[PDB]
Structure formats: C-alpha cells, structure tokens
Paper text:
HP activity is regulated by its first and rate-limiting enzyme glutamine fructose-6-phosphate amidotransferase (GFAT, EC 2.6.1.16). The relative orientation of the two domains with their respective active sites is relevant for catalysis and affected by substrate binding.
The well-conserved C-tail (C-terminal residues 670–681) is the major mobile element between the isomerase and glutaminase domain of GFAT. To independently test whether thermal shift assays can indeed indicate domain interactions, we generated the C-tail lock mutant L405R of human GFAT-1 and characterized it structurally, as well as in thermal shift assays and in kinetic measurements. Miszkiel and Wojciechowski showed in molecular dynamic simulations that the C-tail lock mutation, which introduces a salt-bridge similar as observed in E. coli, limits the C-tail’s flexibility. Therefore, thermal shift assays are a valid tool to analyze domain interactions of GFAT-1.
Residue numbers in the entry:
A (entry chain B): 2 to 227, 242 to 293, 304 to 681
B (entry chain A): 2 to 227, 241 to 295, 300 to 674
C-alpha cells in the first residue's frame, strides 16, 4: 500500500496540475501495491477557489494506477481548468490481500455520503470490529468491508461530540488514534478544515516533503504536547508545497527536503505551516536516476544487469584488495562482542531467507559457530529458543517486513545481540537492531528481488571475512575469497553477455507447466531462489529440489516430459552432482545443466548447457543464480506477463 | 539384492523340500525389487546323498521368482525325491549393477565350468576391474560382465594356491575379502567343503538364523582370531540343526526367531554342523538374540497392497510404538532404550535431528514440541546437506538419527561424523541389527513392524510418536509442565481411535482423488505443526502418484509463491484448531481473493470454514502437537487412491 498527497499553499495549480501530481506520486509507489487506487480532491466549478473547498470528490477504480489515471480524465463533470491558490489532495494505491479490489474498498475512505472526512490508511487496525459496532449504534452506516472505514466514521464521531466550536483538526485525530489499535499511517482531509492535512503514524512509515523558493524558518521542528518559533514555513512569503508520502521515491522528484515522522507524531499543516504534536528537516541522499528504468524496458531487467555495479557498491569503502582487509563500519563497535557469542541465527522471509541459505556454509566455515537459518513466519509460530549469547541476523531488503520485524523484537526480549542486514536506511529493522549493515544496493523497484539478493550474499561474506581475520590458518582462504570478490563484477558481466542464449532456451520451456531445479551444497540456495523467481513472475510451477534428496522420493516425478534444470559446479560436491545427473538421465530426463566453462565432460554429454565462469566455491552461487534470474524474466515475456507487477502480490510484506 | 541359504545338518530333507525352502526364502525378499534370481544346490541322483556332494547344480534365470520356481520343477534329468541328511542350498535375487539382466549375469556366480565354487553377492566390488585383470593373467577366463564373478574366480585362486591340502574354507574366504574393495554380503559353497557354508559382510547386512530341537551350546558366539566345543555354536547332545543365512530377517522369521547379526569383516563358517565366527584383527562375541517379528507382519493379509495395509493398520502400529513405554494409569513415559543415557542427554545443550526424506519430515513435525518441552535449541538437518557443509558439532550436542531402515548412507555417515566430534548419538530406527541402531550410543526402536510398502506410512507416524514420547521424558521433572504432559498423554491415549475415525473417511478421500485424477499439480499449504504435513503429503503424492505436488509454507505465500494461485491450480490447505488458526484463516482469504478454490483439511467442528469452503476433509480434534498425525493420513490415502485410479502399482518401486 502507498500514500501520497499534494498540498500547494498559495502556489497556483490548476485542477489538472494537481491530479497529474497525485497520479505521478502513486506511480512512484505503485510497486508497493497495484490492485487498486484512488484520489481525493476538491470538487465544484467556481472561479473563486474559495467557494469550492466545501465539496470533496473521490475518484477510485480497480486495477493499477493507469486504470485510475484514465478514470480521472475524460470526465463530464470535473473542469480541469480551475486555478487553486490553496488546495489539498490525497491519493493511495492498495494491496488488496483480502476480498475483491473493488472501488468501494479502495482508499480514500469516507465518513458519510457528503465526504466530510476522507482518510488514506496504510496498515491494519486490530480492533476495527469493536469500533464498527460502536459506530453503528450511534447512527453511522458502514459501506465497505475494510478496516480503514472505521477510521473515517470515527474521526467524524469525535467531531460530532467536541466541546468547543473550534477544536483543532489535531485534537480530532488525536482522539481517533487513542481508539485505534495496531499499526497505521494516516493522512486526513476534511471540508471543515480546508487545506489542512493531518499526518500521524504508528508502526508504519510516513514522511512529509517540503519545497519553497524562500528560506525555511527552522530545520528542527520541536515536538509539542497538548507560534512563529514552532512551525516550519517560509519566512517572508507564503509559497510552499508539501508532500505527504509513505516512501521517499514519490517525493524525490519534487524535492529532497523531508521530515521523517516518528511513532505517535501527529503532524498538522495549518495556514501552510507544518507543526508536530504529541523531527529534523534533512536532505535525502537519493538521486532520481536511482528510481528510473534508464534505457531498460523494466525495473527488474535494469536491476539484474546492474548487479556488477550494485555488487561494487556493496563492497565500496569496506573491502581493500591491496592489503586484503575487510571493515564494515556498522559493526566496528560490536564485532568483538559478536565473536564471544556462541551461535548465529539468520531470520528472514523469501529471497532474503535464501540469502542465508546461500551463505550458511561459509559462515560455519569462517566463524566455526553453529549457524541456524529460519523462516521468520515459522520462527514465530514455534517460539524458537533464543539466548543472551545468540547473535541474531535479520535480512530484509525493505527493513519493514512484518514477520522479520516481529522476530527481531522476539529476540531482543530474550537478550540476544541483534544485527540488521537492510537495504533501507532508517527502516524499523535498521533502527531497532543493536548494529547492522546497509547493503547499499540502491532502491529496488522490481517486486522480485534480484540485486538485493546478491548484495545480501556479498554482505554476509564480508562479515564472515571479518570474523576470521585473526586466524593464521584461514589467511589463504580469506585471500582466495577476496580475490574472487575483486573479479566478481567482471564475471557477472560475462554471465549477462549470455542473455540471448538464456532467451533461446526460454523459448523451449515457456509452454511447460512445471520445472524442477536441482542442486546441492552452495547451490541449494540457488535452486530455491531460481524456483521462487520462476514462480513469482512467470507463474510456472517451478520447485527447487535438493539433489541429495532425489533418491528418497522426488526422483519418481522425473520422466522424459518433466523439464529439469541442474546445477553442477566445480566444487567439492561435483562427483555427487554428477551422480544426481546420472539418476535424472536414467529416468529419461533431458535436463538443462548450469555448469562451469571448463567442465568439458558435462558439456559434451549434455545438449543444453549454460556455461558460467568459475569463481570461488563460496561465491559461485552469485554467478549460478543470475542465469535463473534471466530465465525467469524471459519466460515471463514469452508468456505475456509483466516482470515488474506479478499477479496476486506486491513488494515488501509490511503487514501480516 | 536378496540373499538366502538353507543348511540342513542331520535334518533329513528331500531335494524338493530344499528347493521349496529356497524359493520361499526369495519370496520374502521380492519386495526389495529385482530383475533375476537363481539357486545353487547339489546335483546328481545317487540315492546315497553322500556321493552327490561333488556335483553342484545351478538354476539361474532372468525374471521373477515365480518363473524360477517353474524352471526348478521343469527338469527332466533331476530327481526331487533324493533325501539329503546334510545339504547346503543358496538362493539369490539380483538387482543388476554390473552386466545387464540375463541368466549368465545372474547369481550364484561360479568359479569354473565344473562349479567347484559358487557365491551369491549383495553389493558392488569397487576394484573388480583390477581383480579381473589379475585373474585373467593367471589363467582364469570370465564368462559374465558382473563384478561378482571375480569373487568366485578369486576364491578358487586361493584354493589353487593353498599351502596345505587341508586349509580351511574360512582361510580361503579371509584371503578373498582382504583383496576386495567396496560393499558386499557373501555366502560361499564349494564341492571341496561339502556341507559347509561361509558367510561374510562388509557394509551390507547378513544374519544367520538357527533352529534345533536340541539345546544349543551357547547364546553368545565368541570371536576367533588368527576351534573346539567351547568356541562355537552347535546342538549339545545330538547333531541335528538347521541354519538360515539371509540378508533380511523377513526370510528367516517363519522358520526361527533366533538370529545372529554379523558385523563388518566377520567370517562365519559352518563346519561339521557347528557355527563359528572368525576375525583377522571382556572378550568380544556375537549374541544369539530373539526377534519379536512374525510372518504375519510381512504379509498383505486381506489388503490388496502393502501400502493399503500399512496405512490402515496405523491404529495398531501407533499402539505398538507406545506399548510398554507409556503408562496412562499414572501419566509416566519410560523409553527403556534411553535409561542409561537420559541423565547425560538432559545435561546437553542442543538437539540435532539428522535424516533423509520422510524421516527428516518426522523431525520437522516434532521440532516445536521438542523445543517446548526440552527448552533446548532443536536443529533439523537433511543428512546429505549436513555432510556437504561440515556442520559444527560439539561434545555437548545430542544428535538423533531417524531411519526406518537404519542403513541409509547419508544418515549413517552423518552419525559417524558426529561420533568423531564427541556428540552423544541416539538412533530412532525400525530395524533390529541395523547399522544406525548399533553405532549410536543408545536408541529407540519405534516398533512399527516391518515396512514392506515402497513409501513410508506407519514408519512416519511411529517416528512422530517416538519423538513425542522422548520429549515427554525430557520434562518429567518440571512442575510447570505437568498439565501439558497430561494433555499430550491423554491425546496419545485417544490417538488410536482418532486414526480409525480418519480412516473411516476414506470414501471422502476417494471423491477428492477423482477430482484431482486429471490434475498435474497441487499445492499443499500449511504452517506450524502442519508444515511437515505439507512437505510429507507433497512427497507422498510425488513418489506414489507421479504428479507435481508441492508443500508451501503458508506464511511464505505473500513473499512470492502466491502468484501460482488462480481458478485452475488445485490447492489443499490445512487449518486446524491450534494457536495458528487465525493466521491460517488469513492464508485462506489470500488464496480465495486470487480466484483459488482450495480443499481444506480442518477440524470436524470448525463450522465456519466448512460452510465457506466447498470440499473439506473433516478430521477429529487432538492435542496441537499430535494433529500432524491425523492431518497427514488423508494425504497418505489421497496419494494411494490417485495412483490406483491411474493404473499404477503402489507396491512397485519405480525409483531405480
Ligand atoms: O522475490 C521475492 C521477494 O524478493 C520476496 O521473497 C521478499 O524477499 C520478501 O517478501 C521480503 O523481502 P525483504 O524483507 O528483504 O524486503
Ligand atoms: O516415502 C518416502 C521414503 O520412505 C523415503 O523418503 C525415506 O524416508 C528415506 O529414503 C529415508 O529412509 P530411512 O527412514 O530408512 O532412513
Ligand atoms: N553387483 C552385483 C550384485 C548386485 C546386487 O544384487 O546387489 C551384480 O550386479 O551382479
């Protein structure tokens, strides 16, 4: 789900300039949820913009944002020419995990048939059923099945029972959040408070961007508790443009000056002045180019072919190849205490969990500690034992995944040392961990993680290299690995140069219903992540099978018709991988083998081979997964699917 | 693959009776799979059995044992009425590895055209190439492509080059095995040692059954290192005795339940009707022990298949697993196999469960209750991956090895890995005498009865119960857990009848089987206590039905796999009444929202889901940590019925 609102205070914008700004903001957030969308602006057709703030218009439609962008336009009642000196517009894209993504269930919600209060919500209210029965008895009629409607029908209830004729919009919102349980990020708009917006959060992101050619009155808004030296506003004049949003990608295009709110911070823009109730106006360290497709037809394709660069960025300022030293600044004050601990636990979901499987072996090798890799959802169901001398890693590209974040607080309660491996600065997981590392792979827009996986991979390897930098016996092993990392970017380029060869094989498989991907050792993770990618964007039934497990049942599924992909690399499991290949062939399987270029034996005896360059055994997983990223991509194109917006989900599961 | 030899010593038997005994022995060994069988016995039709001991007749044939029996009685030049006071007959079922199936490549292999030496072999001789070259240079011509023939030719080489005219049959075999490499179980017969038998093994099971109406000299055979009445097994006051060599107790139990399990490099010899055990390496020996196995346990009975029998007898096998171990009269659990080690186990700091296939699923299915009741970390490992990674193991680790057969290579090698690192090892097995039950410090025999079916059915649920019972032992001193222990044990008390209740819904499962008859994929979704149910049910349907069933952790849906859901993909969901019930309902709403129409396995009294879901398999409620047994049985049956509908033989391996 995404939030975006545009408040232009004394900056004349026509009704078209505002709508094209709300739509453009949702496009920046569409990857967080594209099942439905909606906008909320002022209606009426009066030249004097003052006589129009009493009429709220809601345009909501099922589908992606492009379905809403067309619904907004070509309307017979809205005149897109009205100049507004002051105006507020709120927008929202929804990830409909439940029920149908109907316009009635999309946001902004309303509080009545006249739109006196409209709210956009990101999160879940854990007691909306109680709030629904209380509001129904007082005389409020509910229309939608969502939990957001109980927030709109309630802000009006606090308005219908106030004490003074002019209670601030903050007071109303403050009484609402006190009756709301769970997490939420809200942005209000009302006809009673024209131009005023109220943005409160609790367990969900919500920042406020600001732009103005004039000087700002301060850079540290003082949080208040229920004047000219308290609010953020232009000094001499009134020209200012605010940008409420749940992410920074929707605001960077307009300005890089935002104010990240905090839990229970009730921001309020009144008379064009931003004030917080119950901060720091800062510069974003992001360039627009980072969230642009460039010359690629899709974000996912860009993010795959940019892995040579993102790998370099992950190691930048951390790996020195002249003296073979590794230093992760985020762990300098804790590395000593980590080494005195007795166990590593890696906790994550989906592709981030695979990154742990991909590096478990080398972590065991170089730390000599037990390494346990856990799926966050299952980790929580079982109340896994955790102790004070456990070091718990939490791998999360977004840094907001629910099950991973709750697992973190579970481990903190038991006194464990917590470490965050994130791709998002200021995220919940990066803040609430004792320490952490920012993989610094750049923004990931494609729903299917690609560079985030390889960057997590490299990051966990760098940690392993630190944990053994005092072992004489492991010095040569460290050198081998670091020389591999030095050569890794160019080898990734070599893999990407086989893009057309991968595309050809894709034309041989796109019609199939299933594909089994088999590997072991360092490439168990490879066959799991490759199977997940193909599931996610192609919708083929791909499954990863541990090669050593074939003989124990799954091999019965292999015949001449069942597609099979095998991974056979020149590491210590080569002979065993060859035995698995022989078993597949005996069952009449005709598999595609991802192997090393020098593996002449495999290349001669196998028709379809993807020949990747050889790297260090504990790094080869990075090179062996990329062909499967590309394969998943091409298969999706052949089948007529979008690689950036796979069906039935969105990016980052921030609510469970 | 299957070995059987019958030695009647001063127990008169006709040639017919001997041949019928050999055939019957192989019939008990067919369930392992094979492609050819043969027998070796004394030829000649001289009415005096003593003059026929110099003519070894062979009858080998490609095909099933039934065809062999027809060839036996189809011999015009053979008189079946000759009575042998002393005679040795050997039989074999072959699973070809070296040399295609054929009469010549079948066992017994002979040393020359006169059959001076014959041998039956289970396994593979690795250095059979080098050995064949050597014997050919010495003037021995080979007639088969089997590695086994080198054994028959080599024993004649030692005989031909013996130093004295009276070198023992044992000495010859000792010199043969000292030149062999690989795995083998062997039974030798020769004209130069009439009436004598020599058995030896290395990495392959070989046991000896014994029967006599007279008292035996001992129940503990002492090892003889490189003779008289005080050193071997024999009937005391008279000569009559019968010996049964076999690679599987199933071929012996109908004649006797007193068996000797040989160990690696043992050379067991019967000379003058007396059994001695030799070795080349407080006094070691081999015990004559009693098996509680019965012939009825390895017979289909009234069932049409072993799979059907072993599924539907699970009420009885669960009861047998608990017999003598659970006392519902006073809420106590006592696994006798752990008496001398339960103290040390409770002082250890981590549990590691190591297994393959369905046995690994048994660990996943009990991980949570083990964590809960032991409060120790519990790590569940796939044996093949456990080996590849050189997983850290410590002296204070308790390592469990789950294995129905007790011989699975990766599981067995994992055991020896942990033993080297000083871990306390525990075997959870279902086969007496197996390697894993021997080499572990202690163990528990799940006592499910022999598993003859190709797929693990009762073994899985008996492993499940066995690990729950161990968990109940580990917390028997905790006041805070008394109630929980009582709840679990009253569930075990009621479990047999609840299984019967699930088996009474077989008709409902058949209806589901016809609905999936034409389907190529099915997703089985669950979490918590039923994660294992999803993985195990998915494996059964893969192994038995040959369709692409996959287990998906419900909590992982929104992280990618949910993209497979639509109106066409068959889905089975598990929703039981435990603490994850609300999260399972969430997963169901996520599937339905994407046009999925899943079949739900739920509690009988879950009225909400039964009304909102078309087809539901309604199982009875048990304790949360025991429901996995009830929820997996409908999936066992589903795989069974789908296979029958598609014309498959559920008792036929496939996995070759
Ligand atoms: O390709 C799949 C996605 O990348 C997905 O599996 C993702 O990994 C999780 O939904 C959470 O990821 P983060 O917690 O790292 O944001
Ligand atoms: O239906 C599944 C099979 O039974 C298979 O997965 C089996 O579990 C393994 O081959 C391990 O066998 P053991 O239990 O003998 O180690
Ligand atoms: N390797 C031997 C015996 C195989 C077996 O049956 O175990 C052969 O192929 O003849």
């Amino acid at each position: 789900c995404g939030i975006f609102a545009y408040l232009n205070y004394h900056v004349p914008r026509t009704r078209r300039e505002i709508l094209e700004t709300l739509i453009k903001g949702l496009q920046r957030l569409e990857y967080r949820g594209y099942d439905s969308a909606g906008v909320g602006f002022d209606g009426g057709n009066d030249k004097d913009w003052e006589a129009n703030a009493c009429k709220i218009q809601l345009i909501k439609k099922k589908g992606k944002v492009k379905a809403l962008d067309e619904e907004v336009h070509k309307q017979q009642d809205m005149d897109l020419d009205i100049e507004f000196d002051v105006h507020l517009g709120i927008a929202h894209t929804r990830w409909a995990t439940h029920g149908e993504p109907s316009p009635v269930n999309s946001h902004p919600q309303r509080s009545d048939k006249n739109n006196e209060f409209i709210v956009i919500h990101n999160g879940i209210i854990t007691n909306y059923k109680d709030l629904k029965k209380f509001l129904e008895s007082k005389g409020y009629d509910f229309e939608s099945e969502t939990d957001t409607e109980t927030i709109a029908k309630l802000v009006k209830y606090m308005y219908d029972n106030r004490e003074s004729q002019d209670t601030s919009f903050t007071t109303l919102v403050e009484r609402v959040i006190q009756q709301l349980e769970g997490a939420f990020a809200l942005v209000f708009k009302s006809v009673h408070f024209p131009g005023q917006a109220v943005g409160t959060r609790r367990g969900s992101p919500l920042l406020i961007g600001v732009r103005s050619e004039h000087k700002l009155s301060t850079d540290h808004i003082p949080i208040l508790y229920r004047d000219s030296t308290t609010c953020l506003f232009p000094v001499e004049e009134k020209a200012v443009e605010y940008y409420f949003a749940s992410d920074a990608s929707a605001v960077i295009e307009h300005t890089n000056r935002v104010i990240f709110l905090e839990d229970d911070d009730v921001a309020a823009v009144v008379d064009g002045r931003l004030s917080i109730h119950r901060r720091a106006v800062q510069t974003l360290q992001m360039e627009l180019q980072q969230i642009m497709k460039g010359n690629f037809s899709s974000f996912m394709q860009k993010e795959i072919f940019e892995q040579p660069e993102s790998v370099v960025n992950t190691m930048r300022g951390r790996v020195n190849f002249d003296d073979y030293t590794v230093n992760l600044g985020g762990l300098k004050d804790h590395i000593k205490e980590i080494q005195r601990c007795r166990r590593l636990i890696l906790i994550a979901c989906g592709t981030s969990y695979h990154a742990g499987v991909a590096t478990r072996q080398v972590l065991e090798e170089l730390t000599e500690l037990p390494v346990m890799v856990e799926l966050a959802s299952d980790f929580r169901d079982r109340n896994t034992p955790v102790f004070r001398d456990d070091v718990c890693f939490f791998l999360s590209q977004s840094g907001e995944t629910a099950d991973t974040l709750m697992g973190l607080r579970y481990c903190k309660e038991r006194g464990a040392l917590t470490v965050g491996i994130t791709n998002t600065v200021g995220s919940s997981i990066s803040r609430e961990t004792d320490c952490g590392v920012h993989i610094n792979a750049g923004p990931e827009i494609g729903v299917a993680s690609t560079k985030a996986y390889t960057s997590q991979f490299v990051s966990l390897v760098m940690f392993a290299l630190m944990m053994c930098d005092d072992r004489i016996s492991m010095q040569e092993r460290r050198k081998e690995i670091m020389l591999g990392l030095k050569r890794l970017p160019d080898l990734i380029k070599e893999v990407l140069s086989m893009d057309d060869e991968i595309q050809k094989l894709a034309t041989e498989l796109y019609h199939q219903k299933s594909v089994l991907i088999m590997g072991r050792g360092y490439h168990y993770a490879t066959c799991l992540e490759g199977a997940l990618k193909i599931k996610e964007i192609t919708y083929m039934h791909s499954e990863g099978i541990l090669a050593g497990e074939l003989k124990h049942g799954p091999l019965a599924l292999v015949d001449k018709l069942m597609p099979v992909i095998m991974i056979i690399m020149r590491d210590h499991t080569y002979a065993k991988c060859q035995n698995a290949l022989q078993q597949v062939v005996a069952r009449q399987g005709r598999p595609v083998v991802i192997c090393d270029k020098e593996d002449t034996e495999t290349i001669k005896n196998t028709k379809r081979t993807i020949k990747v360059p050889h790297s260090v055994d504990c790094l080869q997983g990075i090179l062996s997964v990329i062909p499967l990223q590309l394969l998943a991509f091409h298969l999706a194109v052949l089948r007529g699917y979008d690689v950036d917006f796979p069906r039935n989900l969105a990016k980052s599961v921030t609510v469970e």
